[PDB]
Design a protein around this nucleic acid. Structure first.
Length: 122
DNA sequence: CCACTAACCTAATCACACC
DNA sequence: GGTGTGATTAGGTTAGTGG
C-alpha cells in the first residue's frame, strides 16, 4: 500500500510553479519555507520538484547551489531495528514505514530513503 | 476508455565523516 | 585514496484523478 495521493489546490499549484520557475533546484530551506507557506509536508514538495523537473526536461527535449537537508544521524540502535525489518521485507508499505518511523523517532521520509539506499547496496 | 501525474522506483552520483 | 552512508539527481514505473 502507498500513501494517500494528494490533490493540489489552485493556490498550492501556483505557488509550486512560481517557485520552480525561479529555481528548479531548491535546497531544504526553500523547500521547508514553501511547504509551510502552502500547507503541504516538505517531503511531498520535494517529490513534486523531482516530478516537475522530469516533465520539464522531458518536454524540453521534445520541444527543443543551495544547501541540502542536513545529514540525519542514525544510531546503531535504530539501524539494527531498520536492518531486522529489511531482512523480512525490503519494500515496506507506508504503514510499515510509519510503523518503523514511530519506533525509531526518525521521520518517515527518511525511512523511505534508508530503504532506497539499503536496497541498492545490500 | 484514456491522458495526466503523485508516488514510487533504480542507478549513479554528490557530500560529508572517517581511518 | 578507500569505505560507509545519508541525500540528490535523471528518468522510468505504478497506480489514483478526472476528463
Amino acid at each position: 500500500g502507498r500513501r494517500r495521493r494528494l490533490v493540489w489546490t489552485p493556490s498550492q499549484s501556483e505557488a509550486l510553479r512560481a517557485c520552480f520557475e525561479r529555481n528548479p533546484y531548491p535546497g531544504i530551506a526553500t523547500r521547508e519555507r514553501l511547504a509551510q507557506a502552502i500547507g503541504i509536508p516538505e517531503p511531498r514538495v520535494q517529490i513534486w520538484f523531482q516530478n516537475e523537473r522530469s516533465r520539464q526536461l522531458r518536454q524540453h527535449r521534445r520541444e527543443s547551489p543551495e544547501g541540502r537537508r542536513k545529514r540525519t544521524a542514525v544510531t546503531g540502535s535504530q539501524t539494527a531495528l531498520l536492518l531486522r525489518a529489511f531482512e523480512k521485507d525490503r519494500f515496506p508499505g507506508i504503514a510499515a514505514r510509519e510503523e518503523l518511523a514511530r519506533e525509531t523517532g526518525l521521520p518517515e521520509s527518511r525511512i523511505q530513503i534508508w530503504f532506497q539506499n539499503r536496497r541498492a547496496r545490500h
